[PDB]
Amino acid sequence: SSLPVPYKLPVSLSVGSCVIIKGTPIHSFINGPQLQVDFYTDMDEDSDIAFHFNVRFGNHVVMNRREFGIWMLEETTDYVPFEDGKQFELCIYVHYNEYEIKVNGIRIYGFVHRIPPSFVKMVQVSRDISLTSVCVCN
Amino acid sequence: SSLPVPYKLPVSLSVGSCVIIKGTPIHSFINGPQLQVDFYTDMDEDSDIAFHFNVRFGNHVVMNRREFGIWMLEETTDYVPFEDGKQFELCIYVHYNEYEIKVNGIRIYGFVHRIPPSFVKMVQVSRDISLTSVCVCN
Numbered sequence: 272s273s274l275p276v277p278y279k280l281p282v283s284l285s286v287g288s289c290v291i292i293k294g295t296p297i298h299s300f301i302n303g304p305q306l307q308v309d310f311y312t313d314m315d316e317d318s319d320i321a322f323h324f325n326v327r328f329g330n331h332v333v334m335n336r337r338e339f340g341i342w343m344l345e346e347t348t349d350y351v352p353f354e355d356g357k358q359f360e361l362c363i364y365v366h367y368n369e370y371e372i373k374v375n376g377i378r379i380y381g382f383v384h385r386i387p388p389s390f391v392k393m394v395q396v397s398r399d400i401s402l403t404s405v406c407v408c409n
Numbered sequence: 410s411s412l413p414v415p416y417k418l419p420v421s422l423s424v425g426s427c428v429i430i431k432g433t434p435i436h437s438f439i440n441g442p443q444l445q446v447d448f449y450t451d452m453d454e455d456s457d458i459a460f461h462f463n464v465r466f467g468n469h470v471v472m473n474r475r476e477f478g479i480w481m482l483e484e485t486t487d488y489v490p491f492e493d494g495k496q497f498e499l500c501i502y503v504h505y506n507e508y509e510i511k512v513n514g515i516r517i518y519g520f521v522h523r524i525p526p527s528f529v530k531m532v533q534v535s536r537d538i539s540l541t542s543v544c545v546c547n
């Protein structure tokens with residue numbers, strides 16, 4: 272891996288920001304690897320989470336937020352167009368109303384803001400991947 | 410312009426970070442356009458500057474830092490491989506000892522750190538350009 276995992280990146284996000292994560296699962300899909308991305312409101316990992324994204328590769332995605340320390344109503348999709356063994360590109364685009372999530376150029380979900388994305392101060396990329404690059408673009 | 414100018418971007422920089430700025434001068438070179446990039450230590454524009462970069466297109470580049478509110482010893486180079494009228498790509502790579510400055514893929518300078526780049530909290534892109542994108546990569 273080019274970057275350490277878990278990777279904690281201090282960020283400032285605004286409408287129009289894009290978070291681009293490139294990496295490779297470290298296990299084949301029959302071994303149940305996961306990839307997790309958390310949009311934290313502080314560097315402290317017990318702070319609130321505006322957007323939590325966990326992919327069980329070959330299975331499904333779970334998304335949520337944590338508000339006042341409490342996990343809210345979980346959202347899911349079974350659309351996980353990742354390829355076994357290959358590098359992926361995960362793009363999270365900050366729109367005025369939602370985070371748009373794209374996997375290898377394919378839009379899979381739009382997670383609507385329940386707090387403004389300007390409250391996000393750290394992005395954590397974790398679990399069973401090797402990281403090639405993380406970019407934040409405007 | 411896709412982004413407002415002056416563009417003030419809150420950033421966190423570490424060794425291995427790359428700041429990629431894409432834009433176009435808004436005047437032809439005979440009209441003396443400039444492009445300026447400041448690596449500020451705070452959002453306040455009177456805070457100290459770890460790295461100041463000002464290109465007089467078709468002319469030369471001036472670089473400096475501002476410490477305790479005082480401009481230090483100015484550095485210059487006449488290597489300014491920008492093209493009149495065209496989009497440029499300006500890459501600033503944070504190495505352990507220096508910022509490496511590339512213009513359209515060409516390394517033109519290495520400005521050595523006099524404070525650690527982790528002290529940079531805002532990047533300001535200013536003067537006579539239209540901005541297409543600013544990316545911070547690791």
Ligand SMILES: OC[C@H]1O[C@@H](O[C@H]2[C@H](O)[C@@H](O)[C@H](O)O[C@@H]2CO)[C@H](O)[C@@H](O)[C@H]1O
Pocket residue numbers: 323325333334335342345
């Ligand atoms: O919702 C994401 C969030 O939930 C926790 O796991 C849930 C689990 O998804 C649910 O099926 C079960 O009923 O309650 C669990 C709460 O412990 C995770 O622990 C957390 O990491 C998040 O992934």
Ligand SMILES: OC[C@H]1O[C@@H](O[C@H]2[C@H](O)[C@@H](O)[C@H](O)O[C@@H]2CO)[C@H](O)[C@@H](O)[C@H]1O
Pocket residue numbers: 461463471472473480483
């Ligand atoms: O060194 C960059 C810094 O200097 C100021 O301009 C200098 C100028 O470059 C120098 O030739 C003259 O002798 O002193 C000036 C100080 O006022 C700029 O004002 C500042 O914006 C920076 O560009």
